[PDB]
Design a protein around this nucleic acid. Structure first.
Lengths: 62, 66, 142, 100, 141, 185, 144, 75
RNA sequence: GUUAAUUCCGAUAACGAACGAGACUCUGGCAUGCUAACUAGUUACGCGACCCCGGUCGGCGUAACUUCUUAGAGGGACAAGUGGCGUUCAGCCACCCGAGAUUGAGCAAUAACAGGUCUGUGAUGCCCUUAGAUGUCCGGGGCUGCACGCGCGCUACACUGACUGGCUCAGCGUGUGCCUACCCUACGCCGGCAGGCGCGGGUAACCCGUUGAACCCCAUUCGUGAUGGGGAUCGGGGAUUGCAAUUAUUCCCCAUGAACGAGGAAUUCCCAGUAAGUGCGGGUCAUAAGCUUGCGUUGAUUAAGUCCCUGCCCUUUGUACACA
């Protein structure tokens, strides 16, 4: 399975139980028209690149 | 992380109502104007009211105030 | 003739390093001893940072004499670090052109601001019910 | 003739009036005077039980009095010194006169 | 010429001890190679020439600031009194072993008793300290 | 040297941040690099201002562990100056480059979270902080109750992390944390 | 200069107590009961002994000189503040006796305390602390 | 379970390994040498004292906790 | 909506008020500006001394001054300004400059607790003893005992470490007392040491002391060994305090050298000089800190979120509870 890259654009709210995960908005730089919804732990800033393994797993919007 | 309470707001409003002509626009300009027109107990309280005095004229310069 | 006495003080939590400048040659001394001998010696480049950022030609006509009272083995490293960097701040404002004075501080700011502004972090008071400033005692149930 | 005058007062502002009175009291009489030295204060840290018994949480008191002291030297004879210090004395400030 | 403020001090104690190795007439006490330096040390020195090393350190502290007698110079040669199960505290040095060092430099003219208490540094004690300062500087060249 | 700075005897530049996801959080290039990594602080007063602190400084402050090393900064600054020497004596390259390759290969890109254990993605700033904690602790185990000193165990851990041979203590949880989150998702 | 020498001794034999010759001279002696880290260093300094060498290189004739220093401390100018039996009850001489006599001179005071039935010996009889300690909180591992 | 039965001096079969394989070793420390020879760490420091007298190894940065030595020049 | 907040804006059968928070007081870093400083230093010189004109001397003295030492009046910060968010109102976020764009502490509303203190009181109601005394005084013992369990604490479980030397920097402080018989000590000495003998300074910015305090900086030894980590236990010896230590008051020397391999279920404290490593003062003291209040050195990891757990304050809701 190929490994893509994603860049943070927006943060909505703190997810999880202790608020130790964040609702993250990402866009793929390989195709800016395709975007998925996930969660990221730790401090998150808008406008930085992360590494995403695969897009098969999808977080449910709470 | 700063909220003007009832004591600060009652002291700042009555100053503006009666002494409109003597206040300026910069914080430090009308800061010492408030020194002579009222009996301020402490240094801190004079700077607290005068900031909200200058904060209201930016509302006045925007337009009328209720 | 003109006594070029520039008394400049720099402050730490306890160390107050006061760098006194004069007209002369390029030698720097701290209570007589130079910057090359202050333990620890492992921070050898830390004490020569004004030399390693501004050049010897600036300090050619300036000799620095420093008196130090208070501090520790590490606080006195950063107390002298800002005292002799601010020693030339007041040297060049009263005697020579401000044209030199404006470019120098831009280079010193770009490295770190500690060279110009003192750190206001002091040891706050220890509290009752604790061995430190914030820590509390090990309270136990039953 | 190098007479020393010492000012010890508990209060802060009350000691400021008297030392400034002696500043004015020396200039009005036109004698050579050494300035009143603002000599460092000392705080008596008394930290005890707030509680009489041993029942309750551990609270510690914080008592502090800051006694402050001044010294004024006068290059004047002894007759002038007793004229000034004997008028309008307050309970706050103590007066001590040393010839040397 | 240079003074003691320019020479590396951690090798100056060996350099000053080397000045003491050449003469060797300071009237060393007999019990030196078997006594503990303080009342809070645990062990004995690894080197058998520690008295001439400690006497070198005594002559340079009085060079920086004189007027320190035996009871005040126990503080510089003091340290941690590790009682063991107790928390460690600061303990002063011993009297006699520190006192005999000042006696070793009192007979032959290295130090002289300061007026109104203390140990002043005689001028013969400051020719040799500054003269061997240039020797290490030549060695550092 | 006013025009350029010399980190010890190593050059500041000629260090490549190959991963585009870790470019902002390694500030060792001509903006926050210093001659010696000692400083007062103020980096952790706010949220993201510790990211602008160079990773060499962050790693030396991560050795300040287990009490008897706490309160001692002249340990780790002396250690890291000697630890950079042993790295060059084996590979021969710039040891600042080795640390950059050590951070990338030691941080697992994907970990688990508590919402039963579920797995979500992790932040690059989260990854560099946990990678530093993993590899600084790796030197501590190999130097504890052992003949070898800490300055060689830190050097021997940074070399393999630039290669990724799965013998390092940080790399071991890089396989472990990724694989448990692979099943628990 | 530092290679393995001739007649290398693994274990030395002095006063029916094992000495590890693998260790340094200044600390291999301390394994002997009655001599510790302080007393073993001084006896190397009271004679012309270079303590930078190991305990496998010094000769068997030289240790005879060493053991006479411990057996005759006052005669070989050992200070009196190194002796374990200063002002002895029976013989009254200040001396150090090594590895067999120390317990031999320990134990007769124990029945001397039995012979006088004093309180100090009663704590040895009951197996408790004698220097005025507190067994209310401690002494738990040795008693069941 | 395990005991470090390190040597105190050097045997003839191990002294020649100091004169041949340590010159082939890139990294000269009293910890790696002691690990690869099963000798004392202090013994390896004393072996470095004789090698600097021999003039074959060069020092890099000395410290009391660890001494650092390097090889001779390649050319 | 917003705030740390019943914080305000703003709707409004509420209005006029009041407390708490807020406000008020103490302290910290900013003050090259004033007052003062011979109970503090700075700069220059006079000499004296060292090395080859220059460098050093808390070695002396002096013509000025407060930059370093201190305390009085103070000033300085108020979101003050800019750009985004929000009825664009209360206000919020980031940034320029500036020592501070959220320092810490004291006080802390109504009302209640069958919480403790009669063992703090010549503060006390009721009951008891009051001559063979539960009044008082003296001598001795216990409060220190020990199969055990628990808690507050110190030490380590070692090579980022141990030892030995060189080295170097503090402010809280404190110091001779009504009775009170009781001070901090400088110096030369005897002795390794605890201690002893002579003088002297200081009622304290004058003297201890310029508080040469530690881990930490450097150089040897140690080398994975429960080993030079660890000091528990124990024996012999020297003095201090005390009339009196035996149950070792307290310290000093040698020696004895145990467990302890980073601690299970669990649980405690903390987020910026912060936790923590480390030392010094005060109370406790005739002799004395393993406690504690302060102060000093070194000084971090993570986070700037949440109600998952445990607690706090409201609204709605149901009650057979109301010592809830």
């Amino acid at each position: 399975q190929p490994i893509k890259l994603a860049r943070v654009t927006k943060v909505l709210g703190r997810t999880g139980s202790q608020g130790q995960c964040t609702q993250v908005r990402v866009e793929f730089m390989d195709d800016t028209s395709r975007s998925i919804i996930r969660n990221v732990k730790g401090p998150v800033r808008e406008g930085d690149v992360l590494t995403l393994l695969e897009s098969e797993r999808e977080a449910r919007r709470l | 992380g700063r909220v003007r309470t009832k004591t600060v707001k009652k002291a700042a409003r009555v100053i503006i109502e009666k002494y409109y002509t003597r206040l300026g626009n910069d914080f430090h300009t009308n800061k010492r104007v408030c020194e002579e027109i009222a009996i301020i107990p402490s240094k801190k309280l004079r700077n607290k009211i005068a900031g909200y005095v200058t904060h209201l004229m930016k509302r006045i310069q925007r337009g009328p105030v209720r | 003739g003109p006594l070029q006495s520039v008394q400049v003080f720099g402050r730490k939590k306890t160390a107050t390093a006061v760098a006194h400048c004069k007209r002369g040659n390029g030698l720097i001394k701290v209570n007589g001893r130079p910057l090359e001998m202050i333990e620890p010696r492992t921070l050898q480049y830390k004490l020569l940072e004004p030399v390693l950022l501004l050049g010897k030609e600036r300090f050619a006509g300036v000799d620095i004499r420093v008196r130090v009272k208070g501090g520790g083995h590490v606080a006195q490293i950063y107390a002298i670090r800002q005292s002799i960097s601010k020693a030339l701040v007041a040297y060049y404002q009263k005697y020579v052109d401000e044209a030199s004075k404006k470019e120098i501080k831009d280079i010193l700011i770009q490295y770190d601001r500690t060279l110009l502004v003192a750190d206001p972090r002091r040891c706050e008071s220890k509290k009752f019910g604790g061995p430190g400033a914030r820590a509390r005692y090990q309270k136990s149930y039953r | 003739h190098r007479i020393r005058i010492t000012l010890t007062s508990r209060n802060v502002k009350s000691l400021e009036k008297v030392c400034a009175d002696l500043i004015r009291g020396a200039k009005e009489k036109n004698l050579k005077v050494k300035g009143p030295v603002r000599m460092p204060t000392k705080t008596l840290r008394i930290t005890t039980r707030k509680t009489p018994c041993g029942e309750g949480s551990k609270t510690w008191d914080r008592f502090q009095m800051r006694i402050h002291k001044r010294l004024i030297d006068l290059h004047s004879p002894s007759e002038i010194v007793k004229q000034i210090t004997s008028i309008s004395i307050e309970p706050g400030v103590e007066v001590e006169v040393t010839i040397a | 010429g240079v003074t003691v403020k320019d020479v590396n001090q951690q090798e100056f104690v060996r350099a000053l001890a080397a000045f003491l190795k050449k003469s060797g007439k300071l009237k060393v006490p007999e019990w030196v190679d078997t006594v503990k330096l303080a009342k809070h040390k645990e062990l004995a020195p690894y080197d058998e020439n520690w008295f001439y090393t400690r006497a070198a350190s005594t002559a340079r502290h009085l060079y920086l600031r004189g007027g320190a007698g035996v009871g005040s110079m126990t503080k510089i040669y003091g340290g941690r009194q590790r009682n063991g199960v107790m928390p460690s505290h600061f303990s002063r040095g011993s009297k006699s072993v520190a006192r005999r060092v000042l006696q070793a430099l009192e007979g032959l003219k290295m130090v002289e008793k300061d007026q109104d208490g203390g140990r002043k540094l005689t001028p013969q004690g400051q020719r040799d300290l500054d003269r061997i300062a240039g020797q290490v500087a030549a060695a550092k060249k | 040297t006013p025009d350029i700075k010399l980190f010890g005897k190593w050059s500041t530049d000629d260090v490549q941040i190959n991963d585009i996801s870790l470019q902002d959080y390694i500030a060792v290039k001509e903006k926050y690099a210093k001659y010696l990594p000692h400083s007062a602080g103020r980096y952790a007063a706010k949220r993201f201002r510790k990211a602008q602190c160079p990773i060499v400084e962050r790693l030396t402050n991560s050795m300040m562990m287990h009490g008897r090393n706490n309160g001692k900064k002249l340990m780790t600054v002396r250690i890291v100056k000697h630890a950079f020497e042993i790295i060059h004596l084996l590979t021969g390259e710039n040891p600042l480059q080795v640390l950059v390759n050590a951070i990338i290969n030691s941080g697992p890109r994907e970990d688990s979270t508590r919402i039963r254990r579920q797995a979500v993605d992790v932040s690059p700033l989260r990854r560099v902080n946990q990678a530093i904690w993993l590899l600084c602790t790796g030197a501590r185990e190999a130097a504890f109750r052992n003949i070898k000193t800490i300055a060689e165990c830190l050097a021997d851990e940074l070399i393999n992390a630039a290669k990724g041979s799965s013998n390092s203590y940080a790399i071991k949880k890089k396989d472990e944390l990724e694989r448990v989150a692979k099943s628990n998702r | 200069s530092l290679v393995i020498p001739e007649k290398f001794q693994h274990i030395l034999r002095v006063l029916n107590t094992n000495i590890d010759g693998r260790r340094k001279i200044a600390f291999a002696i301390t394994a002997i009961k009655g001599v510790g880290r302080r007393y073993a260093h001084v006896v190397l300094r009271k004679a012309d002994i270079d303590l930078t060498k190991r305990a496998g290189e010094l000769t068997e004739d030289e240790v005879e000189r060493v053991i006479t220093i411990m057996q005759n401390p006052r005669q070989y100018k050992i200070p009196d503040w190194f002796l374990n039996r200063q002002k002895d009850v029976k013989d009254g001489k200040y001396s150090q006796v090594l590895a067999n006599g120390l317990d031999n001179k320990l134990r007769e005071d124990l029945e001397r305390l039995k012979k006088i039935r004093a309180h100090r010996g009663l704590r040895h009889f009951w197996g408790l602390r004698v220097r005025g300690q507190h067994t209310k909180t401690t002494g738990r591992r040795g008693r069941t | 379970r395990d005991k470090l039965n390190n040597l105190v001096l050097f045997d003839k079969a191990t002294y020649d390994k100091l004169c041949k394989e340590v010159p082939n070793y890139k990294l000269i420390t009293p910890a790696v040498v002691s690990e690869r020879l099963k000798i004392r760490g202090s013994l390896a420091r004393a072996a470095l004292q004789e090698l600097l007298s021999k003039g074959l190894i060069k020092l890099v940065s000395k410290h009391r906790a660890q001494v650092i030595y390097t090889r001779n020049t390649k050319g």
